[model samples]
Each structure stands twice: as structure tokens, then as C-alpha cells.
Target: HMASDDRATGPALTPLVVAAAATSAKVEVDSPPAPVTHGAAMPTLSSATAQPLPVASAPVLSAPLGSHEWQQTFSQQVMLFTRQGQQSAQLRLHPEELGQVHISLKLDDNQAQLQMVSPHSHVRAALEAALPMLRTQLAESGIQLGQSSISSESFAGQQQSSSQQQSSR
Candidate 1:
């Protein structure tokens, strides 16, 4: 009991459904994409203008000054282990580079300052993070610049093994 128009509309409805389904499938298969964010920790390292203090007032020694001696100079006077803010610098050197020990230290109130004498600024940046730890490690070892002992058995073994191996060659 359907009319001619109703019969025609039924045939048209199937093609529209197929067309819509195909269109959606094609979009899913070919759409460009969405963006993603990766979680990462970011630490800030900024460079500020820093001027070295007078040689006598300098907090840390470099090369010619700190090379042979183990010394730490504190500013803001000596504190009694508390009530301290950021205010200190330290220097370490090797006998060979006593005249050009790289410079680095943390002030009680500032980002650590570092300077590389013999090398350029880029190299100085590379060592900044490590320089302070290096000083700490050296202090822990009770060995600094001129006082470090080369007589450790590791050095002795290396010398002996190299000489004997050379003879075998």
C-alpha cells in the first residue's frame, strides 16, 4: 500500500547510509593526526653578569693562586654552621695546571659562578655542573693540587705493567 514516492525514497536511503559510512571510514584512514606532549623535567641555567672580586678578597683561587694550596675563603664573615645564606666559592687545581686551574663555586645566595682560564666560555659551561662536585670529591680525598700523591699502587701498577709489556713487544 506504499506510494511511488515512498518506494523511491527507500532505494535512495541505502546509498546515503553507505556514502556516510565510507566517508567516515576514509577519514579515519587518512586524517593527518593530533599532537602529543612528552613529560620532561626542565631545569633553568641562566647566565648573569659576574665580576671577579679583588684578588685578596676573591672567594676562590684559580690556577696560579689556588694551584698549590687547599684553601676556601668565605665571604659575609665566618658563620657558626647555621644562619648561613648562599655566600661562598671554592677552587681546586692540579700541579700541572696550577697556573690555569679552572674556576667554579656556589655563593650562598647565587647560582654558582665558574670560569675556565685556559679554555673558552663554551668549555667553561661544560664543566660548571661538575666543577663543584669535583672540588667536593677532592676535598673528601684529602688530596689537593700540590699535595696529591702519585704513589698510589694504581699508578705504580700501570707503570710496571707498561714497561714489562713494552719489553715483550
Candidate 2:
């Protein structure tokens, strides 16, 4: 046999049955408002009351140096190429500004000597392209350049000494 507790509860659940209406009635109805247009036409002013338009300034123009002609010159000479370790050559050309050209040969890592000079851009470009290949070709033929630094002082000294010798004779 099971024993049960007889404690009284506070509230008892009672379900209330409610009757629903047969049809639903419309509570409220609304309609959209019409569109509005304003300021469709503007009023024109008299010529006496209107201001005159400002005049535009004239334009300036310039020309390029396209009609200028260029003159070219060429020359050739063999020079000694020497290096203690690794040697590099550099060529700089300025065509538009007086056609100046400079060819620099660096020996080992420090001393550098300027070899060639010219005023023609085309010749400068051609010679600059050929210097490296020529160095390689001479090396293959068992010919090597010296590592001695050819200073500008010695060159100038030689020139002065030559002039002195000519004066003595």
C-alpha cells in the first residue's frame, strides 16, 4: 500500500469557456493622399535689368626644338686596360645639354681614371656599349690591363714636360 499526503493547495485551476463571434467587423479604413507640384514656370527679366557677361582673355603658345638639326663626329684609339682585382667601367652622356660625354674606368675599388671624351651622343652611346665587350675580347686573347692608377697629375706633368722639352730644343 502507498501512503499519500493530504496538504491543501492555495488556488485550483478552472478553465472558462468563451464564445467567438461568427464574423469580424472592419475597425478602420484609410486612402493615399494626392501628389503636389510647385514652381513649374520661372519669370524672365528685362535686358535693361540683367547684367552683361564678362569677356575671356587671349591664350599663349610656345614651340618645341623639333626643327633643330644635329651634327655627329667619330674617332677611334687603342688604350691599355688594367686592374688589380675587379675593374668596372662607366659612361655618362648628356645629349641635350652641350652633348657632354664622360667615360670612367675604376681600378680595383678605389682609383678611377677618365678614359674617353666626346661631344656626339651617338658616338658616346656606341663607345659605351663596346668598352665591356672589348675588355672581354682582349682578356680572351691573353692581354690584360695594368692595375696602376693613371692619375690626372701625371698626365698634366707629361704635357708640361713635353712643352718644356720642346722649348729647350
Candidate 3:
């Protein structure tokens, strides 16, 4: 058995204890806090809660109406487009008055139609313009307009009969 003198007086000085003692010997009195690099004083409660100054935001592209930009603004306004094979069509509604609106239909970039519809008279002029081009394009693509009975003469006949009925009324 180890002699009593060989036993540790207290807990043996471990490497950890020795290192801790060395570090504690260099313990410094807390110095005054280092000079703040952010020289501006922190905002107090009132200033922090104050309303911020208005900042003007930059404007978007200045693209004029009737251009491609108008279509991108479709979210702000109501606009829709569709595609059939390689051909595509777009329709945009523009507010004109309390009861009147303008409808513009675009069949690709080269073909477009506009119509004014008001309480005075409901109009579908765009169909007259857009249909011919659509017909031709579809024909070339081996697709034909449905309802072969709807000839130009038949349409005229229907219009004439409707007007006659209105006149009789």
C-alpha cells in the first residue's frame, strides 16, 4: 500500500486544474467597455416607435399603352390569352366609362381588333376582324371551322329576320 505521505494532500493537480490555474493568474480587472464603433446613439423608445419618413420608390418601365407592357399589366386589369397549336389569341378589357368598355382582341402580333360596347349598343366587332384570319390560319393547319351551315348569306339572312321582328315589335 502507498504511504500516507504518498497520498495526495488534496485532489491531485490534473492538467485541467493546472491550466485553469494558469488562466486564472492572468485574470484581468474588467476594463471600461470598449469604445462603441457605432457612434450613433441607439434610438430611444419614442424615436424607435416614431413614424418613418416616406421614401419614394422608383418607377417601372415607361412603356406606353398598346404595347407589350400593356399585356404584362394584365394583372392590374382583366386580360386573357389562349393558344391553339402554334397560333395564340389575347383579349383585353379596358374601362372607358361607368357603363361602357373597350374590348381588344389580339390574334398574334400582326392581327388585332378593338370594339366599343356601351349601354347604348352592345357590339362584337372584333369577331368580324379576328375570324377571317383565324379561319385562314386554321385552314392551312388542316383544321376547319365547325358548323358548315353558317355561311355568310345565312348570317345576313338571320340578321335581316331579326331586324324585321324588331321592326314588327
- Model 1 per-residue lDDT tens digits across residues 1-169: 8656443443434443333333333334556689998998899889988997555544333333333222333211222112343223223433334434422232333223322334233323323333444445434434222212121122234343334544453
Candidate number with the higher TM-score (1 or 2): 2
Over 99-142, each residue of candidate 3 has an lDDT whose tens digit, in order, gives 32333333444433322232321222333333444445544534
- Model 3 scores a C-alpha lDDT of 0.35
lDDT winner:
2
Clashing pairs in 2: 81-145, 82-145, 82-146
RMSD of each: 21.9, 30.4, 28.2
Judged by whole-model lDDT over C-alpha atoms, candidate 1 comes out at: 0.35
Q: Per the 3 Å backbone cut-off, how many clashing residue pairs does candidate 1 have?
A: 6
Error of 1 at 169 (Å): 75
Task: Give the whole-model CA lDDT for all candidates, comma-separated.
Answer: 0.35, 0.39, 0.35
**What is the number of residue pairs that collide in model 3?**
0
Each prediction's TM-score against the native?
A: 0.18, 0.21, 0.21
